[PDB]
């Protein structure tokens with residue numbers, strides 16, 4: 001009756017004591033919306049397993065005999081052989097199907113949950129918010145009675161067919177979605193998001209075309225892309241709960257999710273959020289929808305009659321009987337709800353405890369809901385090793401013995417990579433080494449700067465989860481406003497010249513080798529004091545503010561910082577060889593155009609004859625310039641043909657590619673299951689089956 | 699220079715290099731050079747091959763041992 005009771009759905013007096021709280025959290029509620037969400041979640045996970053979890057590509061990620069540096073959260077965890085991995089993914093698929101059809105619901109949820117978290121914890125590089133959300137949702141749905149309506153288990157058991165469910169099943173899901181929206185919103189209250197730096201270039205997509213009719217691009221990239229996202233996060237957190245604001249909230253949230261699906265390649269996350277949005281509606285919407293159909297459809301759609309009483313709810317007895325005393329499962333449900341919501345609130349802000357994982361950002365990526373807030377870019381990565389026996393110094397290929405590239409941004413992954421290299425290099429005639437890393441990275445278009453100390457042996461370095469790392473360089477936030485001026489310098493260049501901005505600590509130095517192609521390279525100082533040394537003649541010059549020097553091309557040079565504060569400078573270079581090739585190609589194009597339009601009546605040179613013929617047959621091999629010209633022309637024609645493609649063909653190719661992925665996954669799984677059960681046949685048969693599996697559908 | 703793992707001093711010390719980009723292409727398409735971390739792991743658009751995993755050291759030998767002469 002009270003307005004507060006109507007708006008919030010419960011009275012204050014319900015919270016006065018523990019028993020009334022348990023009764024409130026275990027009141028009867030209709031099961032229909034939960035059943036629909038269970039079906040949709042199962043279907044989306046079934047579609048997601050062969051695509052993003054990597055079942056199609058799993059034959060080339062856990063291949064036996066290959067020497068790879070893994071990144072598990074616990075060093076104890078190690079991958080199983082490939083065949084057992086495919087068995088694990090098969091169990092995942094069966095669990096997902098069971099959840100979708102609601103057949104043996106608890107066993108299905110367990111079989112989907114345990115393997116999913118096993119795969120998730122095994123590799124930290126494949127972490128992301130929309131995998132963590134799927135794991136959490138699978139964890140929650142394991143305990144909920146989501147098989148009481150529109151489920152096969154209802155048909156096999158009368159007691160669980162169209163029965164009531166306690167309220168906290170809905171409460172936990174609504175709390176999870178609200179926490180996602182609100183934590184994402186508050187995390188985006190950052191200087192790099194409210195100012196237009198993160199996602200600065202996404203306003204050029206054609207989906208934002210109508211907004212450009214009334215707003216300029218610069219405002220369209222700030223009011224709509226950035227501020228709109230924050231406002232929608234908070235409002236979609238709040239609007240969906242109340243009845244007055246549910247329609248507008250649903251409209252805005254659906255538009256937001258569809259645009260996120262089209263702009264990005266996040267995957268099934270947008271569709272999962274779309275499927276989770278209706279839960280804030282009344283619990284019984286599928287039932288009234290089924291009621292509003294002809295009788296013929298009603299003979300196939302689920303039941304429309306009122307749900308029957310259950311045993312997992314506290315029923316208020318109005319017959320004069322004493323109220324049903326809550327048992328044990330109800331108290332456990334209430335405690336689970338409260339503790340789980342409190343933990344979900346606490347975990348995103350738990351970065352002051354696990355300081356070993358802290359970096360320029362906070363903690364490992366995946367469980368903070370800070371989506372598209374930081375954009376990084378790397379310039380150079382140098383890995384040096386000193387042998388422990390002879391003392392020789394050498395350099396490693398930066399991406400050696402690895403499959404991902406998040407190890408350039410986290411100290412712990414760097415330590416694991418260093419240990420892996422330490423164990424693996426002795427196969428390559430290198431004794432107990434000492435490994436040094438030098439990585440340059442810039443976040444949100446700042447000065448490129450070191451992230452780890454390049455003078456510290458990572459193999460013998462000290463690292464623990466609950467203590468701050470002492471060899472991670474601080475991020476200079478004092479140089480942030482320069483991002484204005486640098487942008488102006490980015491707009492003052494020609495179509496050929498390029499610029500790279502560097503900021504360096506005192507004491508450290510950068511050694512560089514300008515390649516012979518990059519002639520006409522210059523270095524300019526913006527702030528601080530540096531000394532530039534040429535080692536060809538061992539000559540060092542100290543540069544003051546606003547001074548420019550012309551560096552040699554094809555020789556080594558060094559820059560040392562010799563000020564109390566960090567020093568910022570800039571390299572401005574032009575690629576001469578590309579310019580000369582472009583001029584020669586333009587000259588050749590001019591000559592052929594003169595030949596075609598009737599001018600240049602004189603005989604063509606022999607080297608030009610292959611251009612007109614277009615084929616090297618019965619003649620001398622073409623010169624490199626002719627080959628480059630023909631390759632460029634063929635590439636331009638291929639791109640032009642690709643652009644001129646009707647929509648239906650693109651749709652057909654998309655469907656064929658997806659069908660290929662599904663078929664390959666299924667065939668590989670069948671091959672390995674046969675190997676596990678009946679043993680491994682000869683090599684020729686294995687090769688024949690593998691060749692058959694990879695065949696394109698056509 | 700003893701295998702693909704090692705590189706010479708010159709190639710290691712070139713800071714000013716043209717970078718091939720994890721997302722989209724250096725040649726074309728928007729936002730190649732900025733890094734969004736959350737999106738799925740895929741690389742430059744090309745023939746129907748999804749990932750760079752086949753470029754690992756020793757892939758051909760291990761694949762031949764496990765799945766035979768494909």
Ligand SMILES: C/C(=C\Cc1c(C)c(O)c2ccccc2c1O)CCC[C@H](C)CCC[C@H](C)CCCC(C)C
Nearest residue numbers: 180181184224225228229232233256259260273371372
């Ligand atoms: C890419 C963006 C946010 C990151 C993100 C993603 C990818 C998600 O999947 C989320 C899912 C749930 C909760 C938060 C998520 C999230 O943070 C901004 C995208 C902004 C969009 C393109 C702007 C258009 C929509 C706005 C709100 C229209 C407002 C119109 C005004 C006139 C009011």
Ligand SMILES: *[C@@H]1O[C@H](CO)[C@@H](O[C@@H]2O[C@H](CO)[C@@H](O)[C@H](O)[C@H]2NC(C)=O)[C@H](O)[C@H]1NC(C)=O
Nearest residue numbers: 492493494496497519520521522523572573574
């Ligand atoms: C060398 O590169 C510089 C930049 O490092 C270029 O200098 C430009 O030269 C033209 C000459 O007309 C000026 O108008 C531009 O303002 C200069 N650019 C600057 C200062 O950034 C030039 O392309 C190359 N110059 C030579 C002589 O090789």
Ligand SMILES: *[C@@H]1O[C@H](CO)[C@@H](O[C@@H]2O[C@H](CO)[C@@H](O)[C@H](O)[C@H]2NC(C)=O)[C@H](O)[C@H]1NC(C)=O
Nearest residue numbers: 507508509531533537538539540541560561562
């Ligand atoms: C040119 O000047 C630089 C400026 O530092 C010199 O760098 C120093 O070199 C000496 C050995 O020559 C080292 O002991 C110092 O540690 C270096 N300084 C720093 C800050 O690292 C460089 O040596 C000079 N080169 C020549 C040929 O005189």
Ligand SMILES: *[C@@H]1O[C@H](CO)[C@@H](O)[C@H](O)[C@H]1NC(C)=O
Nearest residue numbers: 426427428429430699700701
């Ligand atoms: C050095 O490594 C090569 C290449 O792996 C190997 O053939 C050889 O056994 C090693 N040589 C010595 C002298 O240990």
Ligand SMILES: *[C@@H]1O[C@H](CO)[C@@H](O)[C@H](O)[C@H]1NC(C)=O
Nearest residue numbers: 515517518575577578714715
């Ligand atoms: C410069 O241009 C040449 C043109 O052939 C190209 O091969 C090269 O990759 C470019 N970059 C460098 C560092 O030489």
